[PDB]
Amino acid sequence: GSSGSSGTGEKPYECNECQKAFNTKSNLMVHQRTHTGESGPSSG
Numbered sequence: 001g002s003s004g005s006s007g008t009g010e011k012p013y014e015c016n017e018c019q020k021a022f023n024t025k026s027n028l029m030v031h032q033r034t035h036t037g038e039s040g041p042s043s044g
């Protein structure tokens with residue numbers, strides 16, 4: 001198998017919270033605030 005997070009597809013938009021690349025900004029922007037809400041990842 002493989003290891004590490006590496007691939008082919010870099011976007012001009014990156015999340016300053018989870019470091020997740022996106023296609024459009026609109027999505028990213030909302031993806032930033034949305035982080036807090038949808039019961040999922042443990043804030044910590």
Ligand SMILES: [Zn+2]
Nearest residue numbers: 015017018020
């Ligand atoms: Zn994010």
